[PDB]
């Protein structure tokens, strides 16, 4: 078979976060980047 649409286009590579805009995901991925 093949992968589904997962309800939203931009699903985070680390967590269950997802959004309808790539710039909004990019802002969420910056939180994962700065957290240490
Ligand atoms: Zn995330």
UniProtKB/Swiss-Prot annotation:
Q: Where is the signal peptide?
A: none
Where Zn(2+) 11 binds, per the record, is at 12, 15, 28, 32
**Where does the protein end up?**
Nucleus; Cytoplasm, Cytosol
Domain of life according to the entry: Eukaryota
As recorded in UniProt, coiled-coil segments are none
Q: In which tissues is it expressed?
A: Isoform 1 is strongly expressed in placenta, spleen, kidney, testis and peripheral blood leukocytes. Expressed in CD4+ and CD8+ T-cells, CD19+ B-cells and CB14+ monocytes. Isoform 3 is strongly expressed in placenta, ovary, tonsil, CD19+ B-cells and CD14+ monocytes.
**Residue spans, zinc finger C2H2-type:** 10-32
Main function: May be involved in transcriptional regulation. Overexpression causes down-regulation of a number of genes involved in the immune response. Some genes are also up-regulated.
- This chain belongs to the protein called Zinc finger protein ZFAT
What is the gene called? ZFAT
